[PDB]
Symmetry: D2
Subunit: 385 residues, 4 copies
């Protein structure tokens, strides 16, 4: 289960670089130089890194400081062969964004958020990114009167439409990926799930430029089934990027390493990504727990990739097992994939087998055989066949 | 706070008619004749009722039995002046639907579910319904291998497209409203939230024929903000119907009377419906607790309407209060409603006030004044001004 | 991973006998004769069964009917070698218990609940049960005024004290195990967690007669860590029985087969039970999904036991691995098990190494090495070492 | 609804002093001098303040710095008439406590945590505190192997027993209050609920010295009913202190002002505290949202007290209303408060009215009338009678 760059594993600078500050806690680790993170991730077999603007260039940097930060980062990428497939904007840390970036009540803040984003889109393209993520973590409210959501969605659409006009104006090939989250740091965040983000994208002027960046733990913060949401995003043609981590159900955003949290959901996720032929980065947005020193940071990052590769092997073995293939037919997964009425509406209306002569009791008596199928899946996951 | 039919309050037959069977419990009330429910609801000031096919006509009825059930119901509606604005299909109780109706793995069950629906669309139109709800409560899974969600969504789209072809073929004006729910009775249900349903509708052949029927408690079963989801549905033009009830957060579907559960969410919901000018039925999908006798059933139904009317008065008083109007300006709700960049992309890029000369610290220091605004809202809700 | 009776696996009659009725659904399976369940469970390698009074003898049975039901059951136990280690009372299905059994507001119902329990304690002892479970699933409320919880706890203590007086009066060796659950079917249930039940037991007249019967899914319905709660029950000496199943987080009570739901929690549970030398029944309180026919019922029951045995092997291998033993020392699990201050309070107060000369920064810099330890645990669970 | 010091409202220095740092965000407010907080809270009508050691004296202060911080604070208390009824230790912010204080795996950290606590107990007594709170926010784990919970509970008991020996040795009257929380900042926290803490206290050497400090939002983070948990703590005689705030269900710890979050739960809480004659501080452990400037901080603090006083008036009016008193009798709340079997076990066994001649159907048919009672409660809360 040794990863290599060909596995397309990527990490945010802010993941392994997390210093361990939490609601209640000061830093437990010193800051990491992005150059060191690139070198250490490459040695573990990562393919690339990703960044927020303010992870790569300290907020408030001069043009000479900005050029030197980017030069040193480019040298680390060149020294390692690491790529930068995705970048994003920090529209959440600075107190100016306390009520939002693109949906701040203050119009001057909304305009600044757009200019900050556009500046970093240019840098992302220079570093070779194909995807630009937007996580509107400050978009939302703690109280009902504070935010008129229809007005906020109008502002959010304006912002994304302006960004689409910008990349079209520059001839850039980059596409956007909107990252849902239901809550935290706002009491409720706008576009709280994959579904809400998919729905929103359909109302943008150029919907083809936008997809989703779903994160395992975010959908699980609403108690939702992450593989099901990924399936809907794939069905819509909108899975442009993905964030992999672990979460234990409905609680604060834990950002555990991938494979931790809901292990069986991780198995079904990998099964789906691999079955569907998802071709994008396998990006980890996780935080090594603050209990860890730097050795533990690199162990946690290595574990992300290891767990993906174990689950990939087990899912592939499940799907290739003739006994599983027989169980899938016994459970009518083949019939689920066949059109209900390719004969057409009139033929269905005229088919007595579909109503007048349908033996509902005989159909009801047919077991689905799902428990045997699921225990084959469990046996494959655990290596107990 | 006395309701009259002009308030457009509606109830499902299955609400006040719930006999009190639960996971763990036998019935605590005798069955109600739909005629008696129509009479009792009319006396409380309801505007109308709604039905599943199998609430009005027992499953398996002969044509003569069906005609007599409908005749008696029509007489009760005529005697009271009650309307039938919405109807729906039961695709969940009979064991044949144990793996779904429109997304059952068994193709013969999917065809039967469509024929059962189409038969009841014809009856709904005869009784004057404008909306046909679909709650796919059996669509989903308890295990990962049992249901390929992309295939299931293909089947769900086929089904809704065939229903749209049917009502277009008959020249009916009825529209569809898809009701999301995240789980229960399936471990995970497909289209689990308002957002997922809105997203799905955009991929139907005739999206204009379909909207959502969100239910208070269903979105709250995922920990989501129900008023925010309603705002997104209104923003999309898709709030075709609504189900009102109460829920205490993330747990089984409680179906408490409206106003119970999350009271402040109920206040902000009513504020939004009324502000937006929502014109559809205020439908209650609730269950009088099984602790209650029939007197308690009618008290619980009356309480649904009373609570709506109290909250309507308090929300209107909040929005009309000059002190609240001043607080809304202090919190920049006026500025949230103004375009970010009607001057256009190039003007924004050339505006030094938006980046080079934006004083981020001065903007960050400006408080939002949201707590004062929210305490005015609390004082209005409680009648403590 | 083949179970035998020596593994002490037990099942409730109501588990494999569940006919599949849910909030929203009619039965999908015919009723099972308890004799057939005993025979089929024995063939799978179960050690025994458990029962509610009303699972073994239909409610309202005559004395001659009761004797014949018990005779046939005793013959099945004799034919198979199956045991009956635990029994319980149904104080939840009949509508008389709609507001509770022992804490019903109606005093005549509370007295009846006690007489119903006492009658079944006598039968449990005749069939050889060592444990008598009490799940107060109707004890609680949907509204705040309905139930004064201090008064209800006074009634609950009276009831348990009377039951303790009864078994002491008869010279029975049976002990009680209180089963917590946070909600469902009541909006909130009294004694909602392991902790609340443990706390309550300490206020009973004869606390030694009472322990807990925790259920995996019940603690997970409150988002709690089931292994941690089991550890507290073991620390208190009160783990008298356990109910094993699966649950996906905070939602309705799913009662999935054991190993389903939170797989890693199942691993840590088995690790703890086995490490601690828990000697009681490994009882499954689960429901084969209603999608299944009888073949699927027996497959789901077999899977409960298989999954326990797989996890037992992997947990034992984890704890016996020298590399894990080294990682445990690196993470200071040895030091967690050593007294903080066996030198005594005065010695601690006089120890400059504990305050004046404690190098907080050196201590803070020491990583815990928990991620490496947890990835060893993951590798052992998955058979990926 | 104007508070005065006679209402016993208290606030932590860290509440109104919260600078607004969150997972994802830098400070939005400057630090407050404790002297200014004491003055501003007094002007709002607060009775007193509370502190962690490190809120009053910066961590690492010299003895001369410590004396000056305490002198200035004492002068502010003297200038205002404010009291200090409770104090606590910060065993969570400094990185040394990353794996716990009293249950850290490192024994030297456990000894330091005890010395840090003991030093602040002495200061708390000097400032007149009656209660010493312990919130073990770092006690717990993110992974299963990291923490053996039985060993951790042994360490936690040693720590609390040593603290009890210390205050007994000094002749102090102060008592301890253990504050449960289910998670955050640890993935799971030990003693996660009121029940678990109550259970633990019964195993301490001197249980009379220890009670609970429950917090509204903490129990609601597990989806539990906070008034029910308070009722159990009152039933046990262990409600030594309480933390009041608001929370929207199962998510990160929001610390909203009291009355926000679950409004009806706030009503039933106040009803219970007032009915029971709870005599301790009404302490607010809340965070003014980071959206707010200092004017908003003081508005949010004022709102805490206002909301308590509104709910106190409405709860008192509910209980005093003759129509409510009649509804309570109709719902048999009087009968809930009467012993089940003061006639004794033998009399119950010999009472045919309790079994052989109990008419279960007549009892089952009697409605509980809980919905009418709850709508009277709603009408009282909303001022809609
Ligand atoms: O909850 C935090 C989010 O996951 C971010 O890390 C985004 O992925 C990018 O800003
Ligand atoms: O959870 C149950 C659903 O709310 C239904 O009552 C639908 O509204 C219509 O089938
Ligand atoms: O939630 C249901 C409970 O688990 C019961 O099955 C008990 O174990 C015994 O009545
Ligand atoms: O979740 C944080 C806790 O509520 C603390 O504020 C305690 O009350 C005292 O340390
Ligand atoms: Mg997970
Ligand atoms: Mg996250
Ligand atoms: Mg992310
Ligand atoms: Mg609600
Ligand atoms: Mg519902
Ligand atoms: Mg509904
Ligand atoms: Mg589980
Ligand atoms: Mg259960
Ligand atoms: Mg159980
Ligand atoms: Mg609250
Ligand atoms: Mg808190
Ligand atoms: Mg607190």
């Amino acid at each position: 289960y040794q990863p290599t760059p060909e596995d397309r594993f990527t990490f945010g600078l802010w993941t392994v670089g997390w210093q361990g500050r939490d609601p209640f806690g000061d830093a437990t680790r010193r800051a990491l130089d992005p150059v060191e993170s690139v070198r250490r991730l490459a040695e573990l077999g990562a393919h690339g890194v990703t960044f927020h603007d303010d992870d790569l260039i300290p907020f408030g940097s001069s043009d000479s400081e900005r050029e030197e930060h980017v030069k040193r980062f480019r040298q680390a990428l060149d020294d390692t062969g690491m790529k930068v497939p995705m970048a994003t904007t920090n529209l959440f840390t600075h107190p100016v964004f306390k009520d939002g970036g693109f949906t701040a009540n203050d119009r001057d803040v909304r305009r600044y958020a757009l200019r900050k984003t556009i500046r970093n889109i240019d840098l992302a393209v220079e570093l070779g990114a194909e995807t630009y993520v937007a996580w509107g973590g400050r978009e939302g409210a703690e109280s009902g009167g504070a935010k008129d959501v229809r007005d906020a969605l109008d502002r959010m659409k304006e912002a994304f439409d302006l960004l689409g006009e910008y990349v079209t104006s520059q001839g850039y090939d980059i596409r956007f990926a909107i990252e849902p989250k239901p809550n935290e740091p706002r009491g409720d965040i706008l576009l709280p799930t994959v579904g809400h983000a998919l729905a929103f994208i359909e109302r943008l002027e150029r919907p083809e430029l936008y997809g989703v960046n779903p994160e395992v733990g975010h959908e699980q913060m609403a108690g939702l089934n992450f593989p099901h949401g990924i399936a809907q995003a794939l069905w819509a043609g909108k899975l442009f990027h993905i964030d992999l981590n672990g979460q234990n159900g409905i609680k604060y955003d834990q950002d555990l390493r991938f494979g931790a949290g809901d292990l069986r959901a991780a198995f079904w996720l990998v099964d789906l990504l691999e079955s569907a032929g998802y071709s994008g980065p396998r990006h980890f947005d996780f935080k090594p727990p603050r209990t860890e020193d730097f050795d533990g940071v690199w162990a946690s990052a290595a574990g992300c990739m290891r767990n993906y590769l174990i689950l990939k092997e087990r899912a592939a073995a499940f799907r290739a097992d003739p006994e599983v293939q027989e169980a899938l037919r016994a459970s009518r997964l083949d019939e689920l994939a066949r059109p209900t009425a390719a004969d057409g509406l009139q033929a269905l209306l005229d088919d007595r087998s579909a109503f007048e002569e349908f033996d509902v009791d005989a159909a009801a008596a047919r077991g689905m055989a799902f428990e045997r199928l699921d225990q084959l899946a469990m046996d494959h996951l655990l290596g107990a066949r």
